[model samples]
Target: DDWEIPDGQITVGQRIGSGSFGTVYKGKWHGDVAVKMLNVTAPTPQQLQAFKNEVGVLRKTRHVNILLFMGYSTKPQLAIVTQWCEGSSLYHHLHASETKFEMKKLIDIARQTARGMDYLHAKSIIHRDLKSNNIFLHEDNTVKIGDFGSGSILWMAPEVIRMQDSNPYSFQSDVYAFGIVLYELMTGQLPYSNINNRDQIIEMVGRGSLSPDLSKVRSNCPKRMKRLMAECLKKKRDERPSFPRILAEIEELARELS
Candidate 1:
């Protein structure tokens, strides 16, 4: 399928990445700007609705730490164009080498991430998939959050998680996921790698089986930092700190490292 390329716009490059729904291509607009084209196949009605919703969310957001939407094409084929990040993802950096980062560097990244999360939470948006892979780091060490594919769940508050009647996607849940991302940055391990499945991991987390292992990840991690991670990962999302509080605590910890 062919998306209607706007007049004067040219396909300047090729594919960059592919996700579950489509392939992303690098393109140019007005000869100078770089954009990402998400080429999607014949989309189902639900997929089409999701594509429109993503467009709405992208258009409504404007932050230096968030990706910018340039434009999109829905006819012929679905394609979304957005401003591209020049640098690689944090996930790539961390996994590319064994070089360990100083606590100060980690704190700097963490603080910026907290700021980005603060921006989203302030807008009442919840980024359900807050992971290192979704955080792109620029040349200046600044960070931007991406991947809104799973962004719709309500805060996984204790009440919400316990209720069979309500969904568990909320701002507080994003905080929990952010805390996990923070933990991954501090120690290069994905959560519950030993667990076989999501259900098992959830059960382990709910039972507090995974709480004690963090101490083994880093020896010099300050007591407060460890405690904060523990609190953030609490199965009861309501018991976790709010984004503002999380930001303050992270900033305070960062100051200690300085």
Candidate 2:
């Protein structure tokens, strides 16, 4: 399981983006790629450990809907290499000026993400860090789930928000996160966009008093898609559908759109 790249083989270039893990670079490793380097200036043991875990998760996961993990390096400073999607992260593309989302394209993302999550669950893995920012987009309107980290408390499920004693991010919580992502896909807006304070958002989302503003979702959105989002956003964790169930619904929805 050691997919290591030679330190000299990689050539890092201009920064395309940055996240909590580190800055992403448009670079080359026999071909074009995206390189996520750990804090090159100063890396802590904790950060290194986290980076290692992300690589480990990628190594275990293999699916077209999941980001392609090319390789990793430790000598020339810690970095993880993956295929570069021209469209970049879903978050950036969604908020970009005047870019319209077609109904079919939106459902395509939903179906693909559900399929990816279904694979992850079957492999007994939980993507605790699923979010729009972590989801990637290809030039051909394809979506790839990537970068595992819980940077946004907005995506946390009710159980996770309340700080459950054990297994905070259960499989069901991931379903809840997917619902939030679907919200973005449908509405083209961030969840809790009006709330600035983290505490207020937490209080509102945690207590089940608030969620993604469904009213803003595109009117042409399919009823099945709307119903699926409602099921996943249920305050009760048990009420949330499993990935297998979600994927099945998404597939049916895709067929309807076609």
Candidate 3:
């Protein structure tokens, strides 16, 4: 491990967030950093392997839109150190009723995410989950894709949810997830509000019976953008555009709006 950090160098600070895998803390390491420490006190062989995979994927990346990985360690504990992002997650921004963004800013977020995904796909790394929650914002208003390998049902592609392991998740699946994030950006409302129960929602989505309503998107939203979202949300995986195509469209739209 070229990226391994000595155990004593890291000092965990206040907990920033927690999820199924671990708790993230604002910490100190050559200044400021965010440390995600796994819950397992003593990892099993399988758990160790999984952590290795996560480190393997994150270590290979170096992009502006993708979160920066500084270092990691399994010595003192299974912890991942990354660049500290002061601003909250994109989930907070989008869901806040009082929040509003200019059209240009909205398109910028979409373009940045597409650029990040495009870079990852080109490297043969699939970000299975690309929802608003996993996207972190910065004090400077820039956003970076984070929380790799974390799972979320709402942001899943139909093919991914339909049959768990029938086929390997491809780049197009990430595109589908990106489309949902676009929908959320266009409309602050959560997807599939018609469904009352989580289990029922999962079943419906897996069967291709439920999807976000395009009509709910703000009237001010661009028609071309809506068409792009529609294409990516298509149930047929092949119909969904690749991140490069998506990025190109968003870049084109951004130029038009500017």
Candidate 4:
């Protein structure tokens, strides 16, 4: 990555944002891309490869909902370029909005995000981290999923938590997390906020002891959407619908809700 590659040269600018894995900046390669530079803190070889792994994974995939990857440069470390979603993450977008989210708009965001995910699944990719925070938004309010660094234990599926780094996951795990995201988008509150213990929540979800408290959500949330979330969070992974099925279900509901 140290070698100069023609046309792919990216000139990084000031910091625009950051997350647990990398920091983002207002970069200009074609004048509007976001450059994400990872820390090699120790600058160790092993650490550097671990950092590049994310770029490699993103390189193989493409979709409107999935963040558009530009390219990766080592320069003795790792720097990734992707289209900037100026509106920031879904977590920030939902929280920052002053008014309650309209049902139709919420369904549209969920539907488009599901379409992106369907493409990933078709490509046999597992988005280990699937949560509102990782879902980015454009100035035009498009849903773009980003930050494929690593999974946050709290946001992970019940089956994959104890199996960390074993790579034992499959497509079903992301569907499980999406159930939680549905709750967050509908309620304008972080999922599982009512619970105090991380381990406790995991155990409950693991054993199917609890799910989203749909009653706390407003009455207007459609019965079909509620049923879809329940199925997404089902304890048995096989019961979860594929992304295509999810997209179909939500699209039908969006039309009905509209």
- Candidate with the greatest lDDT versus the true structure: 3
Per-prediction TM-score to the true structure, in the order listed: 0.80, 0.90, 0.93, 0.86
Expressed as tens digits, the lDDT of each residue in 1-258 for candidate 3 is: 578888789888797779987898998888999989888799899988888888888888899989998988788889998999976777888885456787788888888888889999888888877889988888737788988762478888878877646564888888889999999888766788676677877788878888889999989888989999999998878877887778888898786755
**lDDT score of residue 125 within candidate 1:** 80
Per residue, candidate 1 scores C-alpha lDDT tens digits across 135-213 of 8886638787777642212122233334424656777777777777667776766655565565554444555454425
The alpha-carbon lDDT assigned to residue 206 of candidate 4 equals 62
Model 3 TM-score is 0.93
Candidate 2's C-alpha runs over 4 A off are: 40-54
Ordered by TM-score, highest first, the candidates read: 3, 2, 4, 1
Model 1 lDDT, full chain set: 0.67
* Error of model 1, residue 66, in angstroms: 1.4
Backbone N/Cα/C clashes per model: 5, 0, 0, 1
lDDT of 2 by residue, 5-99 (tens): 87788888888878777888988778899888877756678977777777787788788888888898887788888888875668877886557
In TM-score terms, which candidate is top? Answer: 3
Clash-forming residue pairs, model 1: 153-169, 154-169, 154-170, 155-169, 155-170
How well does model 3 score by local distance difference test?
0.84
Error of 4 at 85 (Å): 1.4
How many clashing residue pairs, candidate 2? 0
Candidate with the larger TM-score of 1 and 3: 3
